[PDB]
């Protein structure tokens, strides 16, 4: 139902001295993580991180594991390589990241495909949205960019982002359908917190919802007032569901005038909430 994403976040962090680089691959579908590879692991393999993946057979794991190993090596080289291009000391730790995968719409039309890299916290080179041309962040990345045009890799990542990524996202949402296609409506309520003779804080809580997308508004007598409102970032509960709140400071004794409004995919219409002595 609606748009979906299959995303992989890969991180390689070099340790000159201290042993080989650390390399981590973690996979998500939408807001939900489903797989991991981690190089520091006693027995380093590609693993499930969502019970429904234990459905997929042993050659998948073995094949994913192996594919994850080539990249550990690729990232080993690409780090020494990058260390030279930037003319850095041999004894500094540094970070390569890579994100890739596909966003499709409800009709499985590829909305956008990704294959992008960062180095030490900044964009390094990215495959553009056309899936044919590359964007380099700086002249160092020009060196890399030229190899990849020359080797023609754009077409190898494109066919994947237009093909496998998408046909496999379809398959994973099939496997974990009773989690990934679910909706958990927010459990929501309004708390009152005195402060001074002049103010009190009202806080509007949305708990235990899925997917992560939510919008909490505060209104005064039926008019909007999002200006003058504290709100925390959406945060994970730890059980696969999310939490968010929005608070407003209001004058003592005017509490009943305010309405928090909660909007989620799970709710048949928005919730209006009002604090009640």
């Amino acid at each position: 139902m609606g748009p979906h994403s299959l995303r992989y976040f890969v991180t390689a962090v070099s340790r000159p001295g201290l042993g080989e680089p650390r390399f981590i691959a973690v996979g998500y579908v939408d807001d939900t993580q489903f797989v991991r590879f981690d190089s520091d692991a006693d027995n380093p393999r590609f693993e499930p991180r969502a019970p429904w993946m234990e459905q997929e057979g042993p050659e998948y794991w073995e094949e994913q594991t192996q594919r994850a190993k080539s990249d550990e090596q690729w990232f080993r080289v690409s780090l020494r390589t990058a260390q030279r291009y930037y003319n850095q000391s041999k004894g500094g730790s540094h970070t390569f990241q890579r994100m890739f995968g596909c966003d499709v719409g409800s009709d499985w039309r590829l909305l956008r495909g990704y294959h992008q890299f960062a180095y030490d916290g900044r964009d390094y080179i990215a495959l553009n949205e056309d899936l044919k041309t590359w964007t380099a962040a700086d002249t160092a990345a020009l060196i890399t960019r030229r190899k990849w045009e020359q080797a023609g890799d754009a077409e190898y990542y494109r066919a994947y982002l237009e093909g496998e990524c998408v046909e496999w996202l379809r398959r994973y949402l099939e496997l974990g359908n009773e989690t990934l296609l679910r909706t958990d409506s927010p459990k929501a309520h309004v708390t009152y917190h005195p402060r001074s003779q002049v103010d009190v804080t009202l806080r509007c809580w949305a708990l235990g919802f899925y997917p992560a997308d939510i919008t909490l508004t505060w209104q005064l007598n039926g008019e909007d007032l999002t200006q003058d409102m504290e709100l925390v970032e959406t945060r994970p509960a730890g059980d696969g569901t999310f939490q968010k709140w929005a608070a407003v400071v209001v004058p003592l004794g005017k509490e009943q005038n305010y309405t928090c409004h909660v909007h989620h995919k799970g709710l048949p219409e928005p919730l209006t909430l009002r604090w009640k002595p």
Binding site: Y8, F100, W148, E164
Partner: peptide, 9 residues
Amino acid sequence: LYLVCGERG
């Protein structure tokens, strides 16, 4: 499905 990197940096 994990797609490996082709040519190196």
